Design a protein around this nucleic acid. Structure first.
Lengths: 136, 180, 110
RNA sequence: AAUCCCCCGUGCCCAUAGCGGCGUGGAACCACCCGUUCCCAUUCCGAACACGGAAGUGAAACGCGCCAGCGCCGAUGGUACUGGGCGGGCGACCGCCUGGGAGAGUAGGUCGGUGCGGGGGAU
RNA sequence: UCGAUCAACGGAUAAAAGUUACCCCGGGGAUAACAGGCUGAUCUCCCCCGAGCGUCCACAGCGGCGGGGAGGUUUGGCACCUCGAUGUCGGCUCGUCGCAUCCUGGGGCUGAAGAAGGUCCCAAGGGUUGGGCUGUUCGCCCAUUAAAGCGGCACGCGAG
RNA sequence: CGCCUCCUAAAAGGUAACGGAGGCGCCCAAAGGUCCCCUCAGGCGGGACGGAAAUCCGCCGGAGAGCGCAAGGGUAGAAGG
RNA sequence: GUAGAGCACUGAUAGGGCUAGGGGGCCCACCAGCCUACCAAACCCUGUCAAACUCCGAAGGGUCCCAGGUGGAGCCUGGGAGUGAGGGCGCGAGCGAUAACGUCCGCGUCCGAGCGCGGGAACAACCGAGACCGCCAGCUAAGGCCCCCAAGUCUGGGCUAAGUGGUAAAGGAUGUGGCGCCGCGAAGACAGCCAGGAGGUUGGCUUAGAAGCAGCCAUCCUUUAAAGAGUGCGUAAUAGCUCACUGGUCGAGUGGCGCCGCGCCGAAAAUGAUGCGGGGCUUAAGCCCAGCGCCGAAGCUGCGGGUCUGGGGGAUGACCC
């Protein structure tokens, strides 16, 4: 994971929709019904992919290790300053533009994702480049 | 090639209903003369899809006034895909804003090379070219490795010239699998 | 930019807040010089100081004191009867000290 | 006297009154300009401010006009949001009815429009 | 117009610490402890994906990484029943249901020759020993045994 | 366990939480008056004792340097020098 | 000014181009070259987040005056007071594990304190609805009409058939039905059929063997059933097998990926069993859309009465509106 040299301790909780979509290579994994996702799990996929792909030609990225999740205590009784930092991860909720390359050229990439996310943690879908995009 | 069926009514209620039948809102626009014409998707799409259609305009039929146009904007649909409003501009004669389809061949020294593959960043060019841009503006080389990269500078510009883009900034570059 | 321009806009805004109703705008330099009267930007502007009716470009900060006293009475009656002050692109010792005394008699009336 | 026009000032409008590029005016403006005993001034110099005047020039500050490259402006549509009433789902949550309905995103837009005093510019 | 952590800051006094299993009086489950309740922490059982072990063979035997539920046990969360009263352990005696079944069988599978193991799905039928030491149920140990299960019922049982 | 500042007060204002954060229980005799002047850090280019960074020259700049002290507001049309 | 939003304010951060700070660099006294090995102020482009970041900006809410404005409240003066702890539901933030019939605050309703009726089985707060008192009167909510029990085992058009009804996810699948789509060379289809499965195809290593059916790639040719750089049972190569092809055989429709709505596997319990019970699956069912119809509240109307309050005639009553 990576949410290094943060700045604060913790966030809060909500969820509902955002701004992920594009393309960025044509080997895409897009979420759909999630929320936050373990930076770890994340790396999981990272691995899954990386390894499948004859183990070399790079994939890309997508979301980030974003926030700090806290179960606070360890199992006590509740009233801590709610302190304790512990699990860091992504906050993606409306089918998000999760972008992963390599040069698989195929349903091979497919598999890669297949497992990566099948795994990961939600109802989600995948594809390629479908309606470009024009900027300034 | 393209065409459509107009909206007398417009804005919300209407485009929604459109959707309902299988029609998405459409903006027909030409240098400060504007009209809301509406989108019959299915076909609409096949068309768009051509994509060659999105890069290099086409002709549309409305009422019976065959005219020249492209997409200058589009609201494609949040919760999935498909759209929320398709946007086209019909041209007079000075087309400067051109993201012409671009193709280039990084003839081997890439993946057959040190494993490294080539990353396509620009792939298209928003330069200038009035009512004159090909379905394929292109360029070529034979290196894709080391820590190699090339862009808008190297470029190599054809006929209806004019770089509305920038002094080079990455058409493409090559990265290693587990290095080279 | 903001620098010298401000020299200006500063005597400006301060002068401006000041409010005893009117202000004459003197203006330094030789033929350059000339001072016009104003009030609230009601829109109006009382009378105009000295149309370059040259009297002695010589060592005459007095060319000044004169044009001044002149404008002094000019307005004095020009616009019946009133009291206020003015601008100035500088302290009152030379050109400007001058427009000053000019005004000075303008009000003094003796 | 009281017509528009050139302007020197000096006013409302906050960047289409901006940056910057080409030009261009002194006749008359006005600027730099000349010099400094005299007002008065630089913790150094009249650099600025200042006094003290022909000149020389219009380089520089400078005013309009052409140029939109950067910047500024930044609609029509369009989605998100949602004020209110109802549904659909154990669910985190989705969706339906009725008014409001920015942003960014191609348009395309601009290189100010003017308040008043006035040297005066055209019997 | 001065003295003032009256600084537990609206400040009883100037001037104050303790300890009670020796204790005693008022009311509240508006607060713990037992258990119950709901939650599930969770632990237990199960289910996905496969990096990957299984000479060869991904998955006969296995699962990295990450993931997804079942259940009400274990270590917890809460406060409403209860403080005009609900006896908490260990064991005894009589036990009653439950299956993720230990022995039983019926099974497909094997890396299954036989035999014997081991690998899952079906099925509670009966059955599911003695002692040792430990107040401990758990446990470790002696001897066997077809086998010598996990657990529900305030961790069943004081009106026994 | 008193007070100031920011979040959550969810847009008026305004509210807990053993909710997040973080300061003060000084002074400044002249940071107290007003008059007159001035006008940032930082970027770049060129320079004695330099020599990442003084001091000076030359450009550049919604002012992000600045204002005893924390935050926030403001704000160099200075409250700033 | 939170939602949104955007990124230029600050802070993040992901793939990118240029750049230096650590460096190879030795020519090693005009001491400067490629590489770059560099952390990049950076760099612009590609990228998404922020309650305590924001260049933009609402959805309402705040409020001043004019106007609606009578229910009936609205105002000020005044004596008699009770709670000073409460819970639930919905939305919005805390927290808690985004757990709990948890606890914190707020907008609303609520429930107590009326919230006594309907109701959903029965259930303080979930949808309907305000009970002053009558009626062997009728219209209705919600939500219902085979039966247990008032009300069509209505009609119409479908889709499931597992009993889903009669709680569950991850996820799995030649379920069921539906798209909006692909193969039809009647130059008569696919599974079923017949026969040939052709000669250079004969190392490249290894040849103990590749002489497709042993490992490191070969991607050519002739040649016709049209051609397997041979997908496959294999050992010692080799030798034999099904079509990947007709070629002929048949011909007349075949194998698919996306998107759909309705089901199954996944989902094992403790006194006994269960959609409420009987029950029921082309009305009897259930899910979806269509329309009609009757049921059922102290809710609403009609015979009447009681009662207080403004006003109305106040004669004492009183009566009536």
């Amino acid at each position: 994971r990576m949410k290094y040299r943060k700045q604060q301790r913790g966030r809060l909780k909500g969820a509902t929709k955002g701004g992920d979509y594009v393309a960025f290579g044509d080997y895409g994994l897009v979420a759909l019904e999630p929320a936050w996702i373990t930076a770890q799990q994340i790396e999981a996929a990272r691995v899954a992919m990386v390894r499948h792909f004859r183990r070399g030609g790079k994939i890309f990225i997508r979301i980030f290790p974003d926030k700090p999740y806290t179960k606070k205590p360890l199992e006590v009784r509740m009233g801590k300053g709610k302190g304790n930092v512990e699990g860091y991860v992504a906050v993606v909720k409306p089918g998000r533009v999760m972008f992963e390359v390599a040069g698989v050229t195929e349903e091979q990439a497919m598999e890669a994702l297949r497992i990566a996310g099948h795994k990961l943690p939600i109802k989600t879908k995948i594809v390629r480049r479908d309606a470009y995009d024009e900027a300034q | 090639m393209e065409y459509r069926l107009k909206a007398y009514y417009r804005e919300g209620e209407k485009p929604s209903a459109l959707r309902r039948a299988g029609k998405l809102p459409g903006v027909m626009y030409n240098r400060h003369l504007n009209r809301k014409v509406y989108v019959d998707l299915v076909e609409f799409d096949k068309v768009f899809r051509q994509a060659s259609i999105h890069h290099v305009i086409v002709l549309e039929l409305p009422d019976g006034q065959s005219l020249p146009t492209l997409v200058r904007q589009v609201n494609l649909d949040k919760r999935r895909r498909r759209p929320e409003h398709v946007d086209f501009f019909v041209l007079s004669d000075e087309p400067v804003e051109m993201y012409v389809p671009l193709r280039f061949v990084g003839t081997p020294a890439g993946v057959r090379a040190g494993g490294v593959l080539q990353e396509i960043h620009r792939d298209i060019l928003v330069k200038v070219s009035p009512r004159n841009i090909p379905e394929f503006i292109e360029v070529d080389v034979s290196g894709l490795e080391i820590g190699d990269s090339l862009h808008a500078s190297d470029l190599k510009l054809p006929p209806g010239v004019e770089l509305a883009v920038s002094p080079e900034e990455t058409i493409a570059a090559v990265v290693p699998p587990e290095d080279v | 930019r903001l620098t010298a321009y401000e020299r200006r806009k500063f005597r400006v805004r301060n002068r401006i807040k000041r409010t005893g109703r009117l202000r004459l705008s003197v203006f330094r330099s030789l033929k350059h010089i000339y001072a016009q009267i104003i009030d609230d930007e009601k829109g109006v502007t009382l009378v105009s100081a000295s149309s370059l009716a040259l009297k002695l470009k010589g060592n005459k900060t007095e060319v000044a004191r004169q044009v001044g006293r002149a404008l002094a009475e000019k307005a004095l009656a020009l616009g019946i009867k009133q009291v206020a002050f003015d601008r100035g692109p500088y302290k009152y010792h030379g050109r400007v000290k001058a427009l000053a005394e000019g005004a000075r008699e303008g009000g003094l009336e003796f």
